Amino acid sequence: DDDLVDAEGNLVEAGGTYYLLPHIWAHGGGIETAKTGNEPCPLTVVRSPNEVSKGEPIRISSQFLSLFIPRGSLVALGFANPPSCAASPWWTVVDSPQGPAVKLSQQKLPEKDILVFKFEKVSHSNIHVYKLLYCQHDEEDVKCDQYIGIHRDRNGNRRLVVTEENPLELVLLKA
Ligand code: NI
């Protein structure tokens, strides 16, 4: 029943702000946004290519009421300071010709659409590192089997998307 642990070994505080950084420093910086396709503002969730950037502060909220996050629980992830055209700060997974992608929405969202993430601890590490799972509807329910990874588009944006191989890994650094 381990609760999530941050980069300094302390429990992640529900609703608190954290920087989602890669385990391997060489993989880039924190998570932020980019404007792609026909988007009116930055509604595409991406990983900063700047290794010194901590990216945007992210709020992690649980499906359960608690001061902490029970790692086996579903979580919603949102930017503490979302772009202007986003209706709310929460990330969602949207279908596309290229496959499911992590985005921000112009629409108000129902809990079932944002409470679709789950952190999965990686065993081979001295600190607490987590892969990020996406959990689609197992209909009245939901199931966490599909991982989140990176896809660099033609312009160099490192978009967070559902991937088959090579899931990203993260450490949660309290802002
Ligand atoms: Ni690793």
Tell me if 86 sits within 8 A of 43, measured CB to CB.
yes
Final resolution, Å: 2.1
Tell me if 16 sits within 8 A of 78, measured CB to CB.
no
CATH code for position 133: 2.80.10.50
Based on the structure, what is the number of domains in the chain? Answer: 1
**One-character DSSP codes across 10-55:** SBPBTT-EEEEE-SSGGG---EEEE--TT-SS--EEEE-S-TT---
How many whole angstroms from 169 Cα to the centroid of ligand 1? 6
Helices (H), the chain: 111-114
The residue with tokens 């009421």 is 65
Experimental method: X-ray
How many whole angstroms from 88 Cα to the centroid of ligand 1? 31
Q: How far apart are CA 160 and CA 64, in angstroms?
A: 25
How many whole angstroms from 84 Cα to the centroid of ligand 1? 34
Q: How far apart are CA 160 and CA 167, in angstroms?
A: 10
Could you list the residue range(s) of the whole structural domain that residue 38 is in? 1-175
